Amino acid sequence: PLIVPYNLPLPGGVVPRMLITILGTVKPNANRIALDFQRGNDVAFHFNPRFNENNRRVIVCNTKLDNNWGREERQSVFPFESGKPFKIQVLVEPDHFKVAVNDAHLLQYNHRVKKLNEISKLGISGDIDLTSASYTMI
């Protein structure tokens, strides 16, 4: 494969028990990946693996409101590797997004944007070959 950046519409927004699955492969020498769950111009949930921030690998999560980034939430557990295939699963739960990578729980992100049914796009960006992006209800 899909063209990156990729826009996946989420019809009617998100809702608890919606599971979003992203399959791809990290490029060689990757620097960054981003998933952006968007409410119009706002980013309800930005999930941003950084492969070289001051020579460290870190996951940064944040929200962008009225074009302003908020307070970052950081996770140093880092399950991605340059050149390797991955699966990201984002399960919407009542009070947070729950993220697993390669079937292992990674992090939760509490809902800052609370109009879940207005979070109606997922952008997928950065240093990946994107194989598929889809959603289902569990």
Ligand SMILES: OC[C@H]1O[C@@H](SC[C@@H](O)Cn2cc(-c3cccc(F)c3)nn2)[C@H](O)[C@@H](n2cc(-c3cccc(F)c3)nn2)[C@H]1O
């Ligand atoms: O906030 C999140 C934002 O970050 C900024 S970079 C600056 C901050 O990182 C500053 N900062 C440090 C800290 C902090 C807090 C505690 C400890 C600590 F060490 C540090 N708190 N704030 C970044 O451009 C943003 N962005 C990334 C992308 C993007 C586009 C395409 C592909 C892709 F993969 C990503 N588009 N926009 C977005 O990721």
